[PDB]
Amino acid sequence: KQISVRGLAGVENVTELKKNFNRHLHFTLVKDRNVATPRDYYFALAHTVRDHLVGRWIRTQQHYYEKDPKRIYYLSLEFYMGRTLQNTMVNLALENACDEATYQLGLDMEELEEIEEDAGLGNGGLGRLAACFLDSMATLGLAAYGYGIRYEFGIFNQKICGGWQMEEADDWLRYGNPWEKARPEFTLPVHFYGRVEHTSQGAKWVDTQVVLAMPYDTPVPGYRNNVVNTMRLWSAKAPNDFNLKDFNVGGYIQAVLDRNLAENISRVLYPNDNFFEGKELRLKQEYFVVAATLQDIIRRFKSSKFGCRDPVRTNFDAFPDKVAIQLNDTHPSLAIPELMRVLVDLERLDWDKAWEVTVKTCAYTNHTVIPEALERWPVHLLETLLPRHLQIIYEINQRFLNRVAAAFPGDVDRLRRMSLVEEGAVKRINMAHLCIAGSHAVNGVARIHSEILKKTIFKDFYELEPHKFQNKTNGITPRRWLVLCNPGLAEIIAERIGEEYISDLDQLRKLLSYVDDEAFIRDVAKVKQENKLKFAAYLEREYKVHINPNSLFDVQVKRIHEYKRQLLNCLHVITLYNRIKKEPNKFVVPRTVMIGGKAAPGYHMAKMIIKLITAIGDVVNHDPVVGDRLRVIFLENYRVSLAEKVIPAADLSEQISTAGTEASGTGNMKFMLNGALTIGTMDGANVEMAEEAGEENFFIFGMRVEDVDRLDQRGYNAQEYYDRIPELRQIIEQLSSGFFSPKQPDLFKDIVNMLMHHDRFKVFADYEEYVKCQERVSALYKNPREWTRMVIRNIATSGKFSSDRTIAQYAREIWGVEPSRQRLPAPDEKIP
Amino acid sequence: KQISVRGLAGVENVTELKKNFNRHLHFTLVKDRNVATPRDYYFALAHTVRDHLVGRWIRTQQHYYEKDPKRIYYLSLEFYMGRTLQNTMVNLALENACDEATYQLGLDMEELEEIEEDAGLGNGGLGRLAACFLDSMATLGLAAYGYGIRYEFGIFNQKICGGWQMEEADDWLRYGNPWEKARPEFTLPVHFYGRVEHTSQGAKWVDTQVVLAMPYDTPVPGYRNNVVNTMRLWSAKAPNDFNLKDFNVGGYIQAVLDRNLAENISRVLYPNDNFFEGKELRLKQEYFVVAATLQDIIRRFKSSKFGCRDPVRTNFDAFPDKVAIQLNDTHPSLAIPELMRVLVDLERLDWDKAWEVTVKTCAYTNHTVIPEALERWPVHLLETLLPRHLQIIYEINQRFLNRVAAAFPGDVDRLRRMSLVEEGAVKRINMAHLCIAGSHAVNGVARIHSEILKKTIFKDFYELEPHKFQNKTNGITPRRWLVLCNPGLAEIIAERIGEEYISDLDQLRKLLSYVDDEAFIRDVAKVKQENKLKFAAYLEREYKVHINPNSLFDVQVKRIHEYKRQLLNCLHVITLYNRIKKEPNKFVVPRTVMIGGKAAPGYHMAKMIIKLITAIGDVVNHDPVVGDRLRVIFLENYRVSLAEKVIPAADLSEQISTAGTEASGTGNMKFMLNGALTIGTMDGANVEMAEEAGEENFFIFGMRVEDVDRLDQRGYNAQEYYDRIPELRQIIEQLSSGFFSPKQPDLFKDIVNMLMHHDRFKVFADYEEYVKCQERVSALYKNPREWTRMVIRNIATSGKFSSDRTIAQYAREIWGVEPSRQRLPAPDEKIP
Numbered sequence A, B: 001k002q003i004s005v006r007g008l009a010g011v012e013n014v015t016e017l018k019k020n021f022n023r024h025l026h027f028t029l030v031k032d033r034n035v036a037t038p039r040d041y042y043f044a045l046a047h048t049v050r051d052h053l054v055g056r057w058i059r060t061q062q063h064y065y066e067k068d069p070k071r072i073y074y075l076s077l078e079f080y081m082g083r084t085l086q087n088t089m090v091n092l093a094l095e096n097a098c099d100e101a102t103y104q105l106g107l108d109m110e111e112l113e114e115i116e117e118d119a120g121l122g123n124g125g126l127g128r129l130a131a132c133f134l135d136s137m138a139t140l141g142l143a144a145y146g147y148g149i150r151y152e153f154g155i156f157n158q159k160i161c162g163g164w165q166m167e168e169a170d171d172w173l174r175y176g177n178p179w180e181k182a183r184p185e186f187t188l189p190v191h192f193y194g195r196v197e198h199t200s201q202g203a204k205w206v207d208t209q210v211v212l213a214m215p216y217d218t219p220v221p222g223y224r225n226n227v228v229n230t231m232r233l234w235s236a237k238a239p240n241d242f243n244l245k246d247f248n249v250g251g252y253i254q255a256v257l258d259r260n261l262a263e264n265i266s267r268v269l270y271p272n273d274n275f276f277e278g279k280e281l282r283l284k285q286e287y288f289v290v291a292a293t294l295q296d297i298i299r300r301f302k303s304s305k306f307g308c309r310d311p312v313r314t315n316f317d318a319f320p321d322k323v324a325i326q327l328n329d330t331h332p333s334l335a336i337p338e339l340m341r342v343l344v345d346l347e348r349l350d351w352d353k354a355w356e357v358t359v360k361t362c363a364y365t366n367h368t369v370i371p372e373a374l375e376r377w378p379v380h381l382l383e384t385l386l387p388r389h390l391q392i393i394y395e396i397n398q399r400f401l402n403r404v405a406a407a408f409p410g411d412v413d414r415l416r417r418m419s420l421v422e423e424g425a426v427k428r429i430n431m432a433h434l435c436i437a438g439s440h441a442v443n444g445v446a447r448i449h450s451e452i453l454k455k456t457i458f459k460d461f462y463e464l465e466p467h468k469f470q471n472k473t474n475g476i477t478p479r480r481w482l483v484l485c486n487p488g489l490a491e492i493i494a495e496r497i498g499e500e501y502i503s504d505l506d507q508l509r510k511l512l513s514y515v516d517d518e519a520f521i522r523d524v525a526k527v528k529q530e531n532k533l534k535f536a537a538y539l540e541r542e543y544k545v546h547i548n549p550n551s552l553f554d555v556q557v558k559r560i561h562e563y564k565r566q567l568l569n570c571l572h573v574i575t576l577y578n579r580i581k582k583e584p585n586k587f588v589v590p591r592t593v594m595i596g597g598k599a600a601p602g603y604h605m606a607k608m609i610i611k612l613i614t615a616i617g618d619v620v621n622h623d624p625v626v627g628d629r630l631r632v633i634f635l636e637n638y639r640v641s642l643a644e645k646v647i648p649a650a651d652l653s654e655q656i657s658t659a660g661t662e663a664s665g666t667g668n669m670k671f672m673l674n675g676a677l678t679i680g681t682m683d684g685a686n687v688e689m690a691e692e693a694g695e696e697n698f699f700i701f702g703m704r705v706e707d708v709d710r711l712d713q714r715g716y717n718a719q720e721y722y723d724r725i726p727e728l729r730q731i732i733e734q735l736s737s738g739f740f741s742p743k744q745p746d747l748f749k750d751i752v753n754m755l756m757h758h759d760r761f762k763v764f765a766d767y768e769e770y771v772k773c774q775e776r777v778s779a780l781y782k783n784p785r786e787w788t789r790m791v792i793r794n795i796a797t798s799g800k801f802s803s804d805r806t807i808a809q810y811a812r813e814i815w816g817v818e819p820s821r822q823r824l825p826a827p828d829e830k831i832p
């Protein structure tokens, strides 16, 4: 029945909304009632909600121009936004008035929200982080700017055909985007290739090709405080001139068709999660965000109340007190040599003076320690495409290694290990060394990840500069991740403690005084039950299904990777299958195991792991002896809007990374706040979460970081595990015999040789502890009342994992900025 | 001071307009007064004017769906619209209220109209015709549809650098288009390549690639009668599937970058005027309009009150009484085999029965007799790209030549001359033969052009089917071409005869009773003078100039071609130059000779002719002895909105085509209605115009069609002319000596060898008569009063050259449709 505090259904504003809705169907959409579709209705609603945003967005921006804050620019190559409609109504408190208004126009608003396409401009974690951050910078009142690429194809749509992933182009822009404001008026040029001449006073980047960067702005509304900040996303556009001009007389028409070569820089998002691919088109995407963003930054500093102020030079020795740029991973590292290039080559500051300014402005977030994720660009590729930025990266290495030398006299290996230039047969630039060297702050995303950085990959850097290294554990936004996807839970919590918790999540602690309160136990388990019934039917309707809603909904949803160990969960699922087929009239707690997530194309192992899951589902789900008891499902095309549907309905969250690989995790937190219990290793933010709810209100198993290290020193031999555990040996035999692949028996023999001979993530070493820890999960699900009271101990202790906490600490400890909860005055106009 | 009847500046609607204008700056544009530019103001105005259009457009279309007219589809690959803002206000009578409203918002509306980009979706004549037709079908109340390609780059922008044309891409869509309504909702597929299998009952076009055709609609408002018709322009979009799907596993990312190959079909307009280029991309553009349009046509027949009606089959033996398709030139000829393909292959009608339906639906306009303009497609290219349409074109040739054979027994040369298949070493299909064979009507665009067709190129066709051949002389729209570009002239005429003439131009005859009326002579010469002063300053401001406004403004503006004979006008200009330098203190009527127009890139001669003109301007305009007396100017980037500025200010119209080459002409008519006097040959519609004003109120010279034919029989020898005329011989010597090219003396030696040795258009044969006829022009300009009274005899007799006359005859004699002047009721809605 919903009607939670989705705000007020004010009679006035409901008459105002129905009116404006009907106006956009007519004037904007040019459609009449006896020819408009649901999609037409979705669009009229989008444009009406978007109209209540703009006086606040115009006022917020006018406001920062006269009040001149220090501004925070968050540079990221991914912004994984998902849908905007419900969120904007949550934030603007329009949700009950517009469901009334559409109720009375006769429509079902929840039906129309499903017509919205996700903005899938990110891959997984790093980009959802960027998107959660944005909401929390807007809610904390900060003059903050998200800058990225407007990709026309975001992350691909995954189709499973014959158990295999088939990729499809994510054509999210086809029907339009009501939430962007193209600003061609504000287009800027980006230069590529060319050459350098060092003439008279200095270096000059000459005979470059030009690509134009065209801005498109989306409003980011804070939670109910009248602040609407901007995300500025750049599109690539060919110049009107050389494309034809100069002697490129190989066809006028061919010359016009070749504009595309240059518009290809923002055509598509590279589909890889935690993996570097040294592709020239990725380096152009990286350089293109940085060049157009830095011109926008320098232009707002110059012409923001310094526009007035002369008397000596444009003094950039105020630039760090007016500017902060956060580098989200090393994909924007070119911001360092680019700020040096404009400062030294264009503004003709002195190197030392421009460097000090660059360091005090810049800061870097590391997102993984895994080697193959790290960005090490071929220097042949850097000086063709950016010959001046390679000069500048050489000068910087030289001055930095002279700082190392002077502080660690004679330690010639330190010099070679700290170098930004990796001498090897294919000399490369290590971009994370660049970022550490040119940022005043470097941070990890969970305390364990941040300690691993200090003790192993950046230890040379940490003893040279202890002061750069920090931690800022990730967060999730309680607006999307609690009140937007779980209005039932938010209602029952608000009903007991109020609504002040959505901008102050630590308040969830007050729920601890209701673990022993019976009305609350019935309510917490009833929302969980409605959400499970609502997801059961989602799959029978939108994908034909019959899952059983009374089973434990066991879900692992995240990008498909070997470190994430979807395969361990796979090994758990066929044990349980085989225990059942051996003692079939033995009771067992029923479960639906749902596993979903995207594989990069060409990550062959990840593509085999999808095929293994669906192959376990083909057998398990069609065995008459198993019945209700076990159902294996692959959840196709996992994305942000599916995550808002499957994380509310889950009972068990599966976060089983090998310890020391998952830097933080954030699905982690989405499940803890929404009432699931976590099975997991002492990895990433899991460690912090078990610390917040009590180890005992969590299900930890497996090796700790020391134990993987103790096992690598020995040498990991999986033949030992196979040999010592019959249950495991049997799974391996089934796999290699063709039990799961009848017609093609040797299909999964790649995963078996991987597990048996070169498994980097030690699946078999965590298997016994995982099957045992999984017995304890089922034992407690059997006790409903007690499963629900540790769920309440998890929800009530989730406050630390709100992004408002993360961002209030980035603000204070790195940007040097202060958070506000205050409402911007922002009404608007009126005259007659 | 303007304020003509540009309608009423109603206080109410002026308050309504200022209000809505301010609304779009805020809600649509997201801009505030202290940050909006002129372009922002232009856009808010465009969106407010466009809002008064939509209830009429939605009502007009609802109206044709219940009233079910026969619909007229005008298939054209060019629609040369120009700007839409002023036109829509002219047609909707909003022009005085919006100039008041913007006056009071403080803006200058005439300033904001100049921010509008032309829709330059056409090359010259054929496409402006299509655009004039559209306005007149909407003004005559016809259920008519313009269908074309939405090109992203229309015809190039011409820059002259060093006297040479330099092409630039026409990026008209950059800042947006407020007048289109994308309708992705209504996307349809177009198939290419594949193969045919003839299975069981019939042929099947199998294994085709698919390109999606995406519709974009623009409103076409009739003059003040509440009718708003649609122009539907198709965009090419890649499928989401094979682009990646199938084994096109040569990169996921490369697969996404290759979507462009298919979106290239509507990237750019081929820049050639009256010239065929057998390029595969042109044939895909041609097939793409036809396939998506014909699906739209069949779908509105089926599902328009026949949607209700069953009881036997969908009977297409009602299709010609419900449908008319006009083929604008042979660029849509594929409509014939495509209607046969759907009817025979898809609806499984019998061939004879589907053919009769195709002929009675189809009709064809020929636009030129010049050979190199004619479209003769390589059959290797037709059966790769469209293997079924080549089967169908073979069957049709076979049945047609069996009709010829039966009626002209034994005439084996007729058979080979009438064939749609030109056997030659590169077998080709003659598309005009196809069009004659599959249309029930074929028409020329001027009576002489239409007689030339019957007597020479299609004479075999005419004696086989006399009944197909017709004439429909072209027209120009008096809305754009009189009241929109010349409000001064329209005011003074309306002031004496009223305003009913703008939808009934023949009324201009009433002005004949004011040739001997003095108030009218002062008024007709004063508007001409204001318009000349307003164009003088246009070039000094927008291009730095100082032309003299008291000189005779002598202008030839049209596409650069050898048949058009810009070179004869060039030969006139240096005679006059040399007469002056020989008798310098002899008075001569001063003139500014303006020549402008676009050359196709790679039409080398046309590109030399531009260079010759600017080279005559470099010498002539910098001779101290010449002074005020002669100024040669190249009018750069001639397009529709420049034509609205230079045709009002002209005194002399130059239409000097070699007789029998210009099929009709329409610049012709624009100048006659706007008060210029025509110098011209007895070519195209010039013949009809001299017939309407009296031969004597015109300046005819040169060979008539018989004389060119009499000279070709002899053989044309230009050495005879050179030999017999000293003035000519001298021009040739100057040209070949380097008089006009000091630093590179042999630069124009290509044009001299062309003139002297292989001039197809007989420049020198019309030279004596042209210099002599030009003496008579200057003699009358010396007599102001008498130049103005023959101008009044030209304006007063222009009525026949309105497109409402052309279209009322296409309607009656070919579409079988009746014209209405009645106002559609069309107000709109209201409720509380």
Ligand SMILES: Nc1ncnc2c1ncn2[C@@H]1O[C@H](COP(=O)(O)O)[C@@H](O)[C@H]1O
Binding pocket: A058, A061, A062, A063, A065, A066, A300, B032, B034, B035
């Ligand atoms: N030159 C100016 N005069 C007055 N207001 C301005 C000016 N420049 C910016 N503003 C205001 O501040 C906003 C900041 O623009 P931007 O620098 O692009 O983020 C503008 O949209 C206006 O509200």
Ligand SMILES: Nc1ncnc2c1ncn2[C@@H]1O[C@H](COP(=O)(O)O)[C@@H](O)[C@H]1O
Binding pocket: A272, A273, A274, A275, A277, A600, A601, A602, A603, A604
């Ligand atoms: N995320 C990944 N993890 C591990 N190996 C990968 C991953 N993505 C790709 N690969 C490997 O790296 C190559 C380049 O990446 P891609 O074309 O994206 O698969 C592939 O051909 C595989 O050999």
Ligand SMILES: Nc1ncnc2c1ncn2[C@@H]1O[C@H](COP(=O)(O)O)[C@@H](O)[C@H]1O
Binding pocket: A032, A034, A035, B058, B061, B062, B063, B065, B066, B300
């Ligand atoms: N199925 C229908 N029911 C009612 N009105 C319709 C229907 N189909 C079309 N119309 C009306 O007629 C117009 C014609 O659409 P079209 O066939 O696309 O040119 C629509 O925009 C509606 O105004």
Ligand SMILES: Nc1ncnc2c1ncn2[C@@H]1O[C@H](COP(=O)(O)O)[C@@H](O)[C@H]1O
Binding pocket: B272, B273, B274, B275, B277, B600, B601, B602, B603, B604
């Ligand atoms: N409109 C034209 N009239 C005459 N010759 C032309 C024209 N356009 C092109 N040509 C010739 O035809 C060839 C193909 O056309 P284009 O590439 O458009 O110039 C050119 O290379 C010239 O040889």
Ligand SMILES: *Cc1c(COP(=O)(O)O)cnc(C)c1O
Binding pocket: A123, A124, A125, A128, A557, A558, A559, A638, A639, A640, A643, A664, A665, A666, A667, A668, A670
């Ligand atoms: C939050 C989120 C993630 C991150 O989940 P992890 O378990 O941290 O990998 C990935 N993808 C989607 C769609 C998400 O919403």
Ligand SMILES: *Cc1c(COP(=O)(O)O)cnc(C)c1O
Binding pocket: B123, B124, B125, B128, B557, B558, B559, B638, B639, B640, B643, B664, B665, B666, B667, B668, B670
């Ligand atoms: C009307 C028009 C033409 C046609 O002029 P002609 O003299 O018939 O060639 C060509 N181009 C433009 C821009 C026009 O407006």
